[PDB]
Amino acid sequence: EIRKLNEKEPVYIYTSFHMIPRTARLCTILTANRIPFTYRDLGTDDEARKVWKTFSKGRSLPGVVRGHNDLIGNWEEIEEANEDYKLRELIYDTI
Amino acid sequence: TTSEIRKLNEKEPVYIYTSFHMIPRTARLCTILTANRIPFTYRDLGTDDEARKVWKTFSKGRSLPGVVRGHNDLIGNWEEIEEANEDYKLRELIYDTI
């Protein structure tokens, strides 16, 4: 039931090294997995910066955050989850 | 009144009703609400009877997607929300109305 509740939350690609190419791969991966998303640009989105600064524990951008601050992973973690065929689960079945 | 209405509205859940340009327009609404710091969740009228009924009853012909406050307070469809946001009055539309 975690799933239904999470599926109602917006998923964000946090963006702002290799920033654009990695952001493009996140866009392609989430699209291929039928995961809807929008961008938040930490260049101009102060709430986004706070969330990332508070939870990233050092992770480089870009990344994926569910809802207000359920940080899911940075680009490398998202790519690994996708390679494990478990991306929808990592995003919609967690916490 | 007014400040009272605001406080009561701050207790209400805000929803984006979604299911043409459905995906691109819904994306915009999400970005707009997010940029206005308005917390929200999605409702898919495809599988959500209440939301589907609410839209049918109150839209008066407006195309989806849209924004709904509480159970039945239709704030606007995507175009109205985009106009309100352009006018810098989206937050007033949502929190200062009965």
Numbering used by the authors:
A (entry chain B): 1134 to 1149, 1155 to 1233
B (entry chain A): 1131 to 1149, 1155 to 1233
Reproduce passages from the article.
Here we report a previously unknown budding yeast polarisome protein encoded by YFR016C, named actin-interacting protein 5 (Aip5). Aip5 is found to accelerate the formation of actin filaments in vitro through its C-terminal folded-domain (Aip5-C) and mediates actin cable assembly in cells. Structural studies by X-ray crystallography and biochemical assays have identified that Aip5-C is in a dimeric form, in which the dimer state and a loop region that directly binds to G-actin play essential roles in regulating actin assembly activity.
To test the L1150 role in actin filament assembly, we generated a protein mutant Aip5-C-L1150A and additional mutations of the amino acids adjacent to the loop region, single mutants Aip5-C-N1162A and Aip5-C-S1165C, and one triple mutant Aip5-C-3m (L1150A, N1162A, S1165C). Of the three single mutants, Aip5-C-L1150A showed the most drastic reduction in the polymerization rate. Notably, the additional S1165C and N1162A mutations to L1150A (Aip5-C-3m) resulted in complete suppression of the actin assembly activity of Aip5-C. To understand the consequences of the triple mutation, Aip5-C-3m was crystallized, and the structure was determined through molecular replacement using the native Aip5-C structure as the search model. Furthermore, the loop sites in both protomers are far apart, with the heads of α1s pointing in opposite directions. Structural comparisons between Aip5-C and Aip5-C-3m suggest that the flexibility and/or the position of the loop plays a critical role in its actin assembly activities.
